Amino acid sequence: IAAMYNNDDGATFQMEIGGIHTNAALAAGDKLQCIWRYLDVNGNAQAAEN
Amino acid sequence: YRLAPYGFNNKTRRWECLDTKYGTKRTYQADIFVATDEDIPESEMTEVY
């Protein structure tokens, strides 16, 4: 994944994808799954899948 | 029944009612309103809050 962060838009957010073989492309509507760790508002680390 | 205006809140991403003092205290999700036609011209609309 590398990085993920929100956007000023109402809907979307931004995500990098990292090392990918050259012969690959993405179309709108594709679905990606990941298990990532984030920092809660209180300052405690959590884990989630989406 | 009185209808009160609802405005989008970019920080929380929900349609929250204006008129805080006297109004409904409910907030609705996005996708409640889906726009596919031409919008109302800005000249015709009246400004509130």
PDB file of N, CA, C and O in Angstrom, chain A:
ATOM      1  N   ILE A   1       0.818  -1.212   0.000  1.00  0.00           N
ATOM      2  CA  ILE A   1       0.000   0.000   0.000  1.00  0.00           C
ATOM      3  C   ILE A   1       0.853   1.264   0.000  1.00  0.00           C
ATOM      4  O   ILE A   1       0.552   2.219  -0.724  1.00  0.00           O
ATOM      5  N   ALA A   2       1.910   1.305   0.812  1.00  0.00           N
ATOM      6  CA  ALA A   2       2.669   2.534   1.085  1.00  0.00           C
ATOM      7  C   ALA A   2       1.745   3.472   1.856  1.00  0.00           C
ATOM      8  O   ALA A   2       1.488   3.205   3.041  1.00  0.00           O
ATOM      9  N   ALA A   3       1.242   4.558   1.270  1.00  0.00           N
ATOM     10  CA  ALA A   3       0.513   5.578   2.015  1.00  0.00           C
ATOM     11  C   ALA A   3      -0.976   5.582   1.689  1.00  0.00           C
ATOM     12  O   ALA A   3      -1.387   5.159   0.606  1.00  0.00           O
ATOM     13  N   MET A   4      -1.779   6.062   2.642  1.00  0.00           N
ATOM     14  CA  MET A   4      -3.195   6.360   2.442  1.00  0.00           C
ATOM     15  C   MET A   4      -3.552   7.618   3.219  1.00  0.00           C
ATOM     16  O   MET A   4      -3.100   7.795   4.354  1.00  0.00           O
ATOM     17  N   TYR A   5      -4.374   8.478   2.623  1.00  0.00           N
ATOM     18  CA  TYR A   5      -4.820   9.688   3.296  1.00  0.00           C
ATOM     19  C   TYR A   5      -6.114  10.179   2.666  1.00  0.00           C
ATOM     20  O   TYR A   5      -6.455   9.806   1.542  1.00  0.00           O
ATOM     21  N   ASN A   6      -6.828  11.024   3.405  1.00  0.00           N
ATOM     22  CA  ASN A   6      -8.121  11.530   2.973  1.00  0.00           C
ATOM     23  C   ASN A   6      -7.955  12.673   1.978  1.00  0.00           C
ATOM     24  O   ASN A   6      -6.853  13.169   1.737  1.00  0.00           O
ATOM     25  N   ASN A   7      -9.078  13.092   1.404  1.00  0.00           N
ATOM     26  CA  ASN A   7      -9.123  14.200   0.466  1.00  0.00           C
ATOM     27  C   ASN A   7     -10.126  15.239   0.943  1.00  0.00           C
ATOM     28  O   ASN A   7     -10.980  14.966   1.792  1.00  0.00           O
ATOM     29  N   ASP A   8     -10.011  16.444   0.384  1.00  0.00           N
ATOM     30  CA  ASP A   8     -10.932  17.517   0.743  1.00  0.00           C
ATOM     31  C   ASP A   8     -12.297  17.311   0.101  1.00  0.00           C
ATOM     32  O   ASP A   8     -13.263  18.001   0.443  1.00  0.00           O
ATOM     33  N   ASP A   9     -12.396  16.372  -0.837  1.00  0.00           N
ATOM     34  CA  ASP A   9     -13.670  16.081  -1.477  1.00  0.00           C
ATOM     35  C   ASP A   9     -14.651  15.488  -0.476  1.00  0.00           C
ATOM     36  O   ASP A   9     -14.273  15.062   0.618  1.00  0.00           O
ATOM     37  N   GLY A  10     -15.927  15.477  -0.855  1.00  0.00           N
ATOM     38  CA  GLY A  10     -16.928  14.857  -0.008  1.00  0.00           C
ATOM     39  C   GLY A  10     -16.865  13.343  -0.029  1.00  0.00           C
ATOM     40  O   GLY A  10     -17.236  12.683   0.944  1.00  0.00           O
ATOM     41  N   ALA A  11     -16.408  12.766  -1.143  1.00  0.00           N
ATOM     42  CA  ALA A  11     -16.546  11.323  -1.321  1.00  0.00           C
ATOM     43  C   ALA A  11     -15.231  10.581  -1.115  1.00  0.00           C
ATOM     44  O   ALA A  11     -15.146   9.686  -0.268  1.00  0.00           O
ATOM     45  N   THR A  12     -14.199  10.937  -1.869  1.00  0.00           N
ATOM     46  CA  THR A  12     -13.091  10.035  -2.145  1.00  0.00           C
ATOM     47  C   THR A  12     -11.928  10.208  -1.175  1.00  0.00           C
ATOM     48  O   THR A  12     -11.909  11.105  -0.330  1.00  0.00           O
ATOM     49  N   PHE A  13     -10.952   9.310  -1.312  1.00  0.00           N
ATOM     50  CA  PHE A  13      -9.677   9.382  -0.615  1.00  0.00           C
ATOM     51  C   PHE A  13      -8.599   8.778  -1.507  1.00  0.00           C
ATOM     52  O   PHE A  13      -8.892   8.064  -2.468  1.00  0.00           O
ATOM     53  N   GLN A  14      -7.343   9.074  -1.186  1.00  0.00           N
ATOM     54  CA  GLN A  14      -6.212   8.774  -2.057  1.00  0.00           C
ATOM     55  C   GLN A  14      -5.422   7.596  -1.501  1.00  0.00           C
ATOM     56  O   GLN A  14      -5.278   7.464  -0.283  1.00  0.00           O
ATOM     57  N   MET A  15      -4.913   6.747  -2.393  1.00  0.00           N
ATOM     58  CA  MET A  15      -4.166   5.553  -2.018  1.00  0.00           C
ATOM     59  C   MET A  15      -3.113   5.228  -3.067  1.00  0.00           C
ATOM     60  O   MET A  15      -3.426   5.151  -4.258  1.00  0.00           O
ATOM     61  N   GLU A  16      -1.871   5.034  -2.623  1.00  0.00           N
ATOM     62  CA  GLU A  16      -0.822   4.484  -3.470  1.00  0.00           C
ATOM     63  C   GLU A  16      -0.852   2.960  -3.423  1.00  0.00           C
ATOM     64  O   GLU A  16      -1.475   2.357  -2.548  1.00  0.00           O
ATOM     65  N   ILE A  17      -0.176   2.328  -4.384  1.00  0.00           N
ATOM     66  CA  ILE A  17      -0.249   0.880  -4.546  1.00  0.00           C
ATOM     67  C   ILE A  17       1.123   0.222  -4.631  1.00  0.00           C
ATOM     68  O   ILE A  17       1.222  -0.997  -4.465  1.00  0.00           O
ATOM     69  N   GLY A  18       2.190   0.980  -4.855  1.00  0.00           N
ATOM     70  CA  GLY A  18       3.493   0.349  -4.712  1.00  0.00           C
ATOM     71  C   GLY A  18       3.922  -0.521  -5.888  1.00  0.00           C
ATOM     72  O   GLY A  18       3.462  -0.372  -7.018  1.00  0.00           O
ATOM     73  N   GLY A  19       4.830  -1.450  -5.588  1.00  0.00           N
ATOM     74  CA  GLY A  19       5.488  -2.229  -6.625  1.00  0.00           C
ATOM     75  C   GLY A  19       4.515  -3.097  -7.403  1.00  0.00           C
ATOM     76  O   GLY A  19       3.853  -3.973  -6.822  1.00  0.00           O
ATOM     77  N   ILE A  20       4.438  -2.889  -8.718  1.00  0.00           N
ATOM     78  CA  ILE A  20       3.487  -3.555  -9.597  1.00  0.00           C
ATOM     79  C   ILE A  20       4.216  -3.924 -10.882  1.00  0.00           C
ATOM     80  O   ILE A  20       5.018  -3.149 -11.403  1.00  0.00           O
ATOM     81  N   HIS A  21       3.937  -5.118 -11.399  1.00  0.00           N
ATOM     82  CA  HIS A  21       4.533  -5.467 -12.679  1.00  0.00           C
ATOM     83  C   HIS A  21       3.952  -4.580 -13.777  1.00  0.00           C
ATOM     84  O   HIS A  21       2.822  -4.099 -13.687  1.00  0.00           O
ATOM     85  N   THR A  22       4.755  -4.355 -14.820  1.00  0.00           N
ATOM     86  CA  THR A  22       4.437  -3.308 -15.788  1.00  0.00           C
ATOM     87  C   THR A  22       3.120  -3.575 -16.507  1.00  0.00           C
ATOM     88  O   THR A  22       2.335  -2.648 -16.737  1.00  0.00           O
ATOM     89  N   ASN A  23       2.856  -4.828 -16.866  1.00  0.00           N
ATOM     90  CA  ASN A  23       1.666  -5.180 -17.644  1.00  0.00           C
ATOM     91  C   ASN A  23       0.460  -5.335 -16.716  1.00  0.00           C
ATOM     92  O   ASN A  23      -0.031  -6.431 -16.452  1.00  0.00           O
ATOM     93  N   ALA A  24      -0.021  -4.199 -16.216  1.00  0.00           N
ATOM     94  CA  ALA A  24      -1.173  -4.186 -15.327  1.00  0.00           C
ATOM     95  C   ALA A  24      -1.888  -2.848 -15.428  1.00  0.00           C
ATOM     96  O   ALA A  24      -1.260  -1.806 -15.626  1.00  0.00           O
ATOM     97  N   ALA A  25      -3.210  -2.886 -15.282  1.00  0.00           N
ATOM     98  CA  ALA A  25      -4.029  -1.686 -15.337  1.00  0.00           C
ATOM     99  C   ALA A  25      -5.254  -1.864 -14.455  1.00  0.00           C
ATOM    100  O   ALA A  25      -5.668  -2.987 -14.159  1.00  0.00           O
ATOM    101  N   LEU A  26      -5.833  -0.740 -14.041  1.00  0.00           N
ATOM    102  CA  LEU A  26      -6.998  -0.719 -13.168  1.00  0.00           C
ATOM    103  C   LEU A  26      -8.136   0.016 -13.859  1.00  0.00           C
ATOM    104  O   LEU A  26      -7.910   1.028 -14.529  1.00  0.00           O
ATOM    105  N   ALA A  27      -9.352  -0.490 -13.693  1.00  0.00           N
ATOM    106  CA  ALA A  27     -10.547   0.160 -14.202  1.00  0.00           C
ATOM    107  C   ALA A  27     -11.446   0.543 -13.037  1.00  0.00           C
ATOM    108  O   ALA A  27     -11.370  -0.041 -11.954  1.00  0.00           O
ATOM    109  N   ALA A  28     -12.298   1.538 -13.267  1.00  0.00           N
ATOM    110  CA  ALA A  28     -13.209   1.986 -12.225  1.00  0.00           C
ATOM    111  C   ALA A  28     -14.160   0.865 -11.828  1.00  0.00           C
ATOM    112  O   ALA A  28     -14.642   0.108 -12.674  1.00  0.00           O
ATOM    113  N   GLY A  29     -14.429   0.760 -10.529  1.00  0.00           N
ATOM    114  CA  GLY A  29     -15.248  -0.305  -9.997  1.00  0.00           C
ATOM    115  C   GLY A  29     -14.484  -1.486  -9.438  1.00  0.00           C
ATOM    116  O   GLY A  29     -15.104  -2.370  -8.836  1.00  0.00           O
ATOM    117  N   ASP A  30     -13.168  -1.533  -9.617  1.00  0.00           N
ATOM    118  CA  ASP A  30     -12.369  -2.608  -9.046  1.00  0.00           C
ATOM    119  C   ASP A  30     -12.334  -2.496  -7.529  1.00  0.00           C
ATOM    120  O   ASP A  30     -12.395  -1.399  -6.972  1.00  0.00           O
ATOM    121  N   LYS A  31     -12.231  -3.640  -6.861  1.00  0.00           N
ATOM    122  CA  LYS A  31     -12.258  -3.699  -5.408  1.00  0.00           C
ATOM    123  C   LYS A  31     -10.945  -4.254  -4.873  1.00  0.00           C
ATOM    124  O   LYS A  31     -10.429  -5.254  -5.379  1.00  0.00           O
ATOM    125  N   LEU A  32     -10.415  -3.598  -3.847  1.00  0.00           N
ATOM    126  CA  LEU A  32      -9.156  -3.974  -3.223  1.00  0.00           C
ATOM    127  C   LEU A  32      -9.380  -4.173  -1.732  1.00  0.00           C
ATOM    128  O   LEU A  32     -10.118  -3.412  -1.103  1.00  0.00           O
ATOM    129  N   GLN A  33      -8.746  -5.199  -1.170  1.00  0.00           N
ATOM    130  CA  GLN A  33      -8.853  -5.515   0.247  1.00  0.00           C
ATOM    131  C   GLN A  33      -7.489  -5.391   0.903  1.00  0.00           C
ATOM    132  O   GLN A  33      -6.467  -5.701   0.285  1.00  0.00           O
ATOM    133  N   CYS A  34      -7.471  -4.944   2.155  1.00  0.00           N
ATOM    134  CA  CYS A  34      -6.214  -4.789   2.870  1.00  0.00           C
ATOM    135  C   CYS A  34      -6.461  -4.845   4.368  1.00  0.00           C
ATOM    136  O   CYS A  34      -7.565  -4.578   4.847  1.00  0.00           O
ATOM    137  N   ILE A  35      -5.410  -5.198   5.103  1.00  0.00           N
ATOM    138  CA  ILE A  35      -5.393  -5.155   6.560  1.00  0.00           C
ATOM    139  C   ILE A  35      -4.354  -4.130   6.983  1.00  0.00           C
ATOM    140  O   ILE A  35      -3.149  -4.366   6.839  1.00  0.00           O
ATOM    141  N   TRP A  36      -4.812  -3.007   7.525  1.00  0.00           N
ATOM    142  CA  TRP A  36      -3.936  -1.880   7.802  1.00  0.00           C
ATOM    143  C   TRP A  36      -4.116  -1.433   9.242  1.00  0.00           C
ATOM    144  O   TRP A  36      -5.124  -1.731   9.885  1.00  0.00           O
ATOM    145  N   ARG A  37      -3.118  -0.716   9.745  1.00  0.00           N
ATOM    146  CA  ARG A  37      -3.111  -0.219  11.111  1.00  0.00           C
ATOM    147  C   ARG A  37      -3.168   1.300  11.102  1.00  0.00           C
ATOM    148  O   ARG A  37      -2.482   1.948  10.307  1.00  0.00           O
ATOM    149  N   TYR A  38      -3.979   1.869  11.988  1.00  0.00           N
ATOM    150  CA  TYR A  38      -4.140   3.311  12.055  1.00  0.00           C
ATOM    151  C   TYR A  38      -4.050   3.789  13.497  1.00  0.00           C
ATOM    152  O   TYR A  38      -4.032   2.996  14.439  1.00  0.00           O
ATOM    153  N   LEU A  39      -3.978   5.108  13.653  1.00  0.00           N
ATOM    154  CA  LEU A  39      -3.941   5.754  14.958  1.00  0.00           C
ATOM    155  C   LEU A  39      -5.323   6.303  15.278  1.00  0.00           C
ATOM    156  O   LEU A  39      -5.852   7.133  14.535  1.00  0.00           O
ATOM    157  N   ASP A  40      -5.896   5.851  16.388  1.00  0.00           N
ATOM    158  CA  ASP A  40      -7.183   6.362  16.824  1.00  0.00           C
ATOM    159  C   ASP A  40      -7.066   7.837  17.205  1.00  0.00           C
ATOM    160  O   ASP A  40      -5.976   8.411  17.264  1.00  0.00           O
ATOM    161  N   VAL A  41      -8.219   8.457  17.460  1.00  0.00           N
ATOM    162  CA  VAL A  41      -8.227   9.852  17.890  1.00  0.00           C
ATOM    163  C   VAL A  41      -7.559   9.991  19.252  1.00  0.00           C
ATOM    164  O   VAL A  41      -6.844  10.964  19.515  1.00  0.00           O
ATOM    165  N   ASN A  42      -7.776   9.016  20.134  1.00  0.00           N
ATOM    166  CA  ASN A  42      -7.205   9.050  21.473  1.00  0.00           C
ATOM    167  C   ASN A  42      -5.699   8.824  21.484  1.00  0.00           C
ATOM    168  O   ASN A  42      -5.072   9.027  22.528  1.00  0.00           O
ATOM    169  N   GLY A  43      -5.110   8.415  20.366  1.00  0.00           N
ATOM    170  CA  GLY A  43      -3.687   8.160  20.302  1.00  0.00           C
ATOM    171  C   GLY A  43      -3.270   6.716  20.466  1.00  0.00           C
ATOM    172  O   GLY A  43      -2.084   6.461  20.700  1.00  0.00           O
ATOM    173  N   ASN A  44      -4.195   5.770  20.354  1.00  0.00           N
ATOM    174  CA  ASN A  44      -3.898   4.353  20.499  1.00  0.00           C
ATOM    175  C   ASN A  44      -3.989   3.659  19.147  1.00  0.00           C
ATOM    176  O   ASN A  44      -4.924   3.899  18.378  1.00  0.00           O
ATOM    177  N   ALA A  45      -3.017   2.799  18.863  1.00  0.00           N
ATOM    178  CA  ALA A  45      -2.991   2.094  17.589  1.00  0.00           C
ATOM    179  C   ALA A  45      -4.085   1.038  17.530  1.00  0.00           C
ATOM    180  O   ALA A  45      -4.386   0.375  18.526  1.00  0.00           O
ATOM    181  N   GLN A  46      -4.684   0.885  16.351  1.00  0.00           N
ATOM    182  CA  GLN A  46      -5.702  -0.128  16.117  1.00  0.00           C
ATOM    183  C   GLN A  46      -5.409  -0.829  14.800  1.00  0.00           C
ATOM    184  O   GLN A  46      -4.507  -0.443  14.056  1.00  0.00           O
ATOM    185  N   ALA A  47      -6.184  -1.872  14.519  1.00  0.00           N
ATOM    186  CA  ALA A  47      -6.092  -2.615  13.272  1.00  0.00           C
ATOM    187  C   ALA A  47      -7.484  -2.797  12.688  1.00  0.00           C
ATOM    188  O   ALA A  47      -8.459  -2.949  13.430  1.00  0.00           O
ATOM    189  N   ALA A  48      -7.578  -2.783  11.361  1.00  0.00           N
ATOM    190  CA  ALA A  48      -8.858  -2.917  10.686  1.00  0.00           C
ATOM    191  C   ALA A  48      -8.659  -3.504   9.298  1.00  0.00           C
ATOM    192  O   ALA A  48      -7.570  -3.430   8.728  1.00  0.00           O
ATOM    193  N   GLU A  49      -9.727  -4.087   8.760  1.00  0.00           N
ATOM    194  CA  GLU A  49      -9.753  -4.609   7.401  1.00  0.00           C
ATOM    195  C   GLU A  49     -10.921  -3.975   6.662  1.00  0.00           C
ATOM    196  O   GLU A  49     -11.949  -3.667   7.275  1.00  0.00           O
ATOM    197  N   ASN A  50     -10.768  -3.780   5.356  1.00  0.00           N
ATOM    198  CA  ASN A  50     -11.761  -3.037   4.594  1.00  0.00           C
ATOM    199  C   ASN A  50     -11.695  -3.438   3.129  1.00  0.00           C
ATOM    200  O   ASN A  50     -10.759  -4.104   2.684  1.00  0.00           O
TER     201      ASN A  50
END
